[PDB]
Amino acid sequence: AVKKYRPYTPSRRQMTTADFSGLTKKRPEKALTEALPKTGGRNNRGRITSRFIGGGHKRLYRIIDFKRRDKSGVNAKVAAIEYDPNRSARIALLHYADGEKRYILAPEGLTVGATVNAGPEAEPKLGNALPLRFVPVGAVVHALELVPGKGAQLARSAGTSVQVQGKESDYVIVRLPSGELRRVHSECYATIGAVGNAEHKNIVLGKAGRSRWLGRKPHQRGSAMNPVDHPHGGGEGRTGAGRVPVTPWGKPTKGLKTRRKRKTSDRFIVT
Amino acid sequence: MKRTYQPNNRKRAKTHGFRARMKTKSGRNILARRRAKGRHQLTVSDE
RNA sequence: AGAAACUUGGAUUUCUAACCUGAAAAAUCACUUUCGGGGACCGUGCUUGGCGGGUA
RNA sequence: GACAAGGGUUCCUGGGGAAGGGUCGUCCGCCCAGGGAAAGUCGGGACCUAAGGUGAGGCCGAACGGCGCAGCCGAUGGACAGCAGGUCAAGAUUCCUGCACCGAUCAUGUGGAGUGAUGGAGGGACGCAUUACGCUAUCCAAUGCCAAGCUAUGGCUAUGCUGGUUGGUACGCUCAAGGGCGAUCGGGUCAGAAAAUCUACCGGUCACAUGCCUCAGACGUAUCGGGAGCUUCCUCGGAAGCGAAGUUGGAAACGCGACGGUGCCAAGAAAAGCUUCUAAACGUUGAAACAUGAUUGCCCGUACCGCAAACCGACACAGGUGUCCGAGUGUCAAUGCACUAAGGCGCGCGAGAGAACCCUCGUUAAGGAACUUUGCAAUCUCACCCCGUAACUUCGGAAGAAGGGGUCCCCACGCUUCGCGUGGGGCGCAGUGAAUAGGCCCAGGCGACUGUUUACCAAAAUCACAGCACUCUGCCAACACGAACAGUGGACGUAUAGGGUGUGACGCCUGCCCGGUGCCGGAAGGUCAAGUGGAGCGGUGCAAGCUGCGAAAUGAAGCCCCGGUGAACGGCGGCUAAGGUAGCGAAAUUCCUUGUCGGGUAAGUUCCGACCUGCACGAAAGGCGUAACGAUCUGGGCGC
RNA sequence: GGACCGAACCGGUGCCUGCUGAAACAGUCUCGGAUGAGUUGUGUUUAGGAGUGAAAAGCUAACCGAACCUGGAGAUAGCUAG
Numbered sequence A: 001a002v003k004k005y006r007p008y009t010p011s012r013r014q015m016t017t018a019d020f021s022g023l024t025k026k027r028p029e030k031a032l033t034e035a036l037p038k039t040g041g042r043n044n045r046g047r048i049t050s051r052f053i054g055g056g057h058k059r060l061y062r063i064i065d066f067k068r069r070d071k072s073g074v075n076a077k078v079a080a081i082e083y084d085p086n087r088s089a090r091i092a093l094l095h096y097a098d099g100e101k102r103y104i105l106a107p108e109g110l111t112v113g114a115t116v117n118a119g120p121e122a123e124p125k126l127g128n129a130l131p132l133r134f135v136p137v138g139a140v141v142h143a144l145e146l147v148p149g150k151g152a153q154l155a156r157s158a159g160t161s162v163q164v165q166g167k168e169s170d171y172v173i174v175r176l177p178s179g180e181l182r183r184v185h186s187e188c189y190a191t192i193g194a195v196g197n198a199e200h201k202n203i204v205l206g207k208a209g210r211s212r213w214l215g216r217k218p219h220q221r222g223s224a225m226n227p228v229d230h231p232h233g234g235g236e237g238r239t240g241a242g243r244v245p246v247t248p249w250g251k252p253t254k255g256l257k258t259r260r261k262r263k264t265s266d267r268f269i270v271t
Numbered sequence B: 001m002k003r004t005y006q007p008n009n010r011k012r013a014k015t016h017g018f019r020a021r022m023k024t025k026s027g028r029n030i031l032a033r034r035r036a037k038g039r040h041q042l043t044v045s046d047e
Numbered sequence C: 001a002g003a004a005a006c007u008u009g010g011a012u013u014u015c016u017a018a019c020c021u022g023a024a025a026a027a028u029c030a031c032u033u034u035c036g037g038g039g040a041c042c043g044u045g046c047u048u049g050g051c052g053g054g055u056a
Numbered sequence D: 001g002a003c004a005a006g007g008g009u010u011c012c013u014g015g016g017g018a019a020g021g022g023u024c025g026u027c028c029g030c031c032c033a034g035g036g037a038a039a040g041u042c043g044g045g046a047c048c049u050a051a052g053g054u055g056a057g058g059c060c061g062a063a064c065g066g067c068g069c070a071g072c073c074g075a076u077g078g079a080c081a082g083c084a085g086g087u088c089a090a091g092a093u094u095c096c097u098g099c100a101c102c103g104a105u106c107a108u109g110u111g112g113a114g115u116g117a118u119g120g121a122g123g124g125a126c127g128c129a130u131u132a133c134g135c136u137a138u139c140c141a142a143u144g145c146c147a148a149g150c151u152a153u154g155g156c157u158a159u160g161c162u163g164g165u166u167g168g169u170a171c172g173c174u175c176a177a178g179g180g181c182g183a184u185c186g187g188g189u190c191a192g193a194a195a196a197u198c199u200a201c202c203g204g205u206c207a208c209a210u211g212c213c214u215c216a217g218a219c220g221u222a223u224c225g226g227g228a229g230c231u232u233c234c235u236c237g238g239a240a241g242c243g244a245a246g247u248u249g250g251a252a253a254c255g256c257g258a259c260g261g262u263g264c265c266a267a268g269a270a271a272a273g274c275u276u277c278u279a280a281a282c283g284u285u286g287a288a289a290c291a292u293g294a295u296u297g298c299c300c301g302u303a304c305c306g307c308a309a310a311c312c313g314a315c316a317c318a319g320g321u322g323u324c325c326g327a328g329u330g331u332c333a334a335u336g337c338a339c340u341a342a343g344g345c346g347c348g349c350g351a352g353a354g355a356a357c358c359c360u361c362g363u364u365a366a367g368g369a370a371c372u373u374u375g376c377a378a379u380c381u382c383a384c385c386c387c388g389u390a391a392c393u394u395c396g397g398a399a400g401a402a403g404g405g406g407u408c409c410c411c412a413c414g415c416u417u418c419g420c421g422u423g424g425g426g427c428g429c430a431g432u433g434a435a436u437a438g439g440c441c442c443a444g445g446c447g448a449c450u451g452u453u454u455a456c457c458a459a460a461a462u463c464a465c466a467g468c469a470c471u472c473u474g475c476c477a478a479c480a481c482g483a484a485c486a487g488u489g490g491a492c493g494u495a496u497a498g499g500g501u502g503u504g505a506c507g508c509c510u511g512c513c514c515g516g517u518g519c520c521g522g523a524a525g526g527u528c529a530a531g532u533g534g535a536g537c538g539g540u541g542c543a544a545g546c547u548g549c550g551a552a553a554u555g556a557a558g559c560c561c562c563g564g565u566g567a568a569c570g571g572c573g574g575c576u577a578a579g580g581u582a583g584c585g586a587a588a589u590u591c592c593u594u595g596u597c598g599g600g601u602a603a604g605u606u607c608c609g610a611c612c613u614g615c616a617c618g619a620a621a622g623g624c625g626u627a628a629c630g631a632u633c634u635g636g637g638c639g640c
Numbered sequence E: 001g002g003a004c005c006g007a008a009c010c011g012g013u014g015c016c017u018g019c020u021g022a023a024a025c026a027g028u029c030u031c032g033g034a035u036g037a038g039u040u041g042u043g044u045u046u047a048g049g050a051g052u053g054a055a056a057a058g059c060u061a062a063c064c065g066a067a068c069c070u071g072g073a074g075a076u077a078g079c080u081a082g
């Protein structure tokens, strides 16, 4: 379920592109779209900060409802499912019985025109948004809140599950997509099921221009540079001694986490 | 062979203009410096 | 050597007004507040020692 | 030819002639003086918002200062009412002429009541490629029309020749492709802060073609212009009057109908004007809105140069400079090439001479790369039809492989026209008759590929690239800018994500060595700062006391110590921790070297293939292959 | 369609010519790209140990292994000139 091409050009031989047939063809829905992509490659005072950002196709923002808390007890019909330029994880338009539209993340397997619901009295159906205290053990969910309110944060890229583990009082163990175990407040909301578009990993951008269309820009190696520019660079011929990043450090196995209050709220983080 | 100086009335008025010097302290220092030399308007705005 | 009290310190723990932080009619800030979560931690101020071609 | 930028009177007239002008100069973009520049409708402003800037309050900060919401500024974009002509020496959608339109204020009447926001709704609100129908600009033909006259060289006596052949407006039961369309009643409060007769959702009803609505544009009638020319004056050459015709056939946009259709993924501003709703307020005798008359129309820009002698280049400089129009004939097409129209120019020293030599060209006997570092350079090839076309391959390609043929004029016949096929005939050395137009092939090294780079000696085998791997980061993320508990980037992102690093399509693969170093983990022991501790030692005082010094014990991270770790830094040898698994090897690596054999050549220090004796190959500083690609580098061959 | 040929346009491959140039980087010829990682206008943001950089120590107003201007400043000059 992904497009391919005859080698009619050297670069179409490997290029592959995602299936769109399930996406409703419709404009992003005005007023739910603050647009203002305002692409910005640099940093607050004109310096570049994350290297190598660069212009790609202009985007508009779709305002997702990442909390889904104020519509508790209120059914919503699935209007359509759509491309989102900025999310890697298709959105689902929602027509509430209130008669107000709102975007959501698209759960894998959420068919158009299904009814979905929010709030503590909400059966653990696909696409429902309910608190972790009410999620049955072992259930797979996405779109979960790190804190009660403030919105979801941890399971949002396509194919990202977070499976419930145990239940300490006022808290709930969970397995993050990274595999780390995390205590999380039972008052946080989450949505049932995995994120959709699960096969997004396997698209292969067949040429340079593709990474450019995505707004990634050519990414220099240090070894190509000069001593002035980067530690690996310089020397006649090719190599490097000590292995370190841009400004110096490990890139192998220097732990980067500090000694925070968060460190008490997760079991066995590694991998 | 495009050369270094490509005129532009808004460019020149914007950088170098009297409102631009007066803005920053060090520009107002250029203003006091030129007045002290008695320049025929060093200020670039409307000479 | 056994009890009470004044306790003063250390560690486990737990709590909530300091402090951090998030949603709500008022987008940064202030407010009430429901509240929510964190929480004497972190942040920061002074001082101790280690690392420190990133720089000089 | 018309503009923007930029320049600044360079424009027009009348004068001038020192200097500028590469010579001259009576001339000039030079000198002097005088004049010229006209806007309710074109562009901007009294309208709007983007990036960005700025910012009361607010968040930071040795000072100065840095941030930052609303708000405000900011066109390169949104919105918005006029067209056709005439004409100063010099302006013109600005003035004059003919007709038109837009808002405002007021007056007469109709109307007859509701108007309806700093707030809601909807809408303005958008991509890329390709494409059907109709049409205009606009261009072409003619024995259509109109006007002028002549013609002669040999002929034509006009069915020859030259020129011209409609723009605006208004009406029109005339033709007309294309294009836009739901209407409504009620329900839910949980939706738009509240409200709402507006919008969103739900449901009852027709929502077939249709049916409305729309005119691009055409035809017609009228009308205001224009119109080839003609008439007279003429102060050197201008001025004023009059004015025919307007056919039929064909071609055609990137413009118009438009916000059409279809497909695609990388998923294509905002805000006001605008249309709906109400709150509040006034009003419900005198409202909205309509019509007719009137008065009203502010500020800035308009000259001239504007692919260049008027702008950037010190120059009247062979350079550079964003947009728009850019006719004709021929030629598959075209903005190409050749000639040419309108229009613009002959480049501000000139004349002779026809030596050496130097530049840019034309031809060349016989030979044909013998030249040379090298076929460097310059030939050869060349367009469009037709036939034909290899190893190898990722089955797309290599491919315009290679190679061969045709190409002009006339007649007849056929056909889907312009045009083409067929048959016959003619002419020249020659028929893409001139101009624009690939030389090809075999075989290697390197990189897969398109791309990128040393502005001004290097375009590459360099960078990047898709793909691969390690490692980090749980979100106020890791990392990065930063006076800083500010703010910001990462990112309005969330492990299918983001940072860092090395490798570098694809295929088969990626070995041995954890001793040293880095990293990750361990933790019995050794060690280790300040601080807590205060044994004891000393000064001074008669004393109380005041005072200098200071030991054990205890006290973190860190290092010693232990284990692991290689797409971590690394190592894989000498007549240590290990010592090269596959692959390749005289190589972009080979010193001895022109290694030895073979191939190619008459002859081969180069190049191909083998061997291995690898001075000093080898597996993601990747090993070995690989079709295709290449202004890459190397050796051969054909052609010239 | 980071497909082909090829004008505009962007570029700068090889030779010659120019070398007190027509020009402080050019001309003729030839050559690369030419729907894309494309070309270009206006507005605007990032700068000195700093910015940028498909990476040359390139570029940062005609000579960048650390710009220009002013200042310390008559730096210091075991060196050369006079």
Ligand SMILES: CC[C@H]1OC(=O)/C=C/[C@H](C)[C@@H](O[C@@H]2O[C@H](C)C[C@H](N(C)C)[C@H]2O)[C@@H](C)C[C@@H](C)C(=O)/C=C/[C@H]2O[C@@H]2[C@]1(O)CO[C@@H]1O[C@H](C)[C@@H](O)[C@@H](OC)[C@H]1OC
Binding pocket: E019, E024, E025
């Ligand atoms: C010929 C081209 C240029 O010269 C050279 O390359 C070289 C010239 C000499 C031979 C050389 O001497 C040699 O040095 C050696 C170290 C030693 C040797 N000894 C043994 C004698 C000596 O012989 C030099 C250093 C001498 C020195 C006076 C000098 O520096 C001259 C500089 C420039 O004027 C010259 C140019 O003529 C300018 O040409 C420019 O080319 C550009 C591409 C153009 O764009 C244009 O630029 C706008 C143009 O004009 C600038």
Ligand SMILES: [Mg+2]
Binding pocket: A004, A005, A006
């Ligand atoms: Mg297929």
Ligand SMILES: [Mg+2]
Binding pocket: none
């Ligand atoms: Mg940097």
Ligand SMILES: [Mg+2]
Binding pocket: A219
């Ligand atoms: Mg990469």
Ligand SMILES: [Mg+2]
Binding pocket: A224, A225, A226
């Ligand atoms: Mg380098």
Ligand SMILES: [Mg+2]
Binding pocket: none
């Ligand atoms: Mg170097």
Ligand SMILES: [Mg+2]
Binding pocket: A227, A230, A231
């Ligand atoms: Mg360094």
Ligand SMILES: [Mg+2]
Binding pocket: A236, A237, A238
């Ligand atoms: Mg080396």
Ligand SMILES: [Mg+2]
Binding pocket: A231, A232, A233, A234, A235, A239, A240, A241
């Ligand atoms: Mg190095």
Ligand SMILES: [Mg+2]
Binding pocket: A246, A247, D480
């Ligand atoms: Mg860094």
Ligand SMILES: [Mg+2]
Binding pocket: B040, B041, B047
């Ligand atoms: Mg003055």
Ligand SMILES: [Mg+2]
Binding pocket: B045, B046
């Ligand atoms: Mg001014």
Ligand SMILES: [Mg+2]
Binding pocket: none
């Ligand atoms: Mg210290």
Ligand SMILES: [Mg+2]
Binding pocket: none
């Ligand atoms: Mg140093």
Ligand SMILES: [Mg+2]
Binding pocket: none
């Ligand atoms: Mg050191």
Ligand SMILES: [Mg+2]
Binding pocket: none
């Ligand atoms: Mg101007």
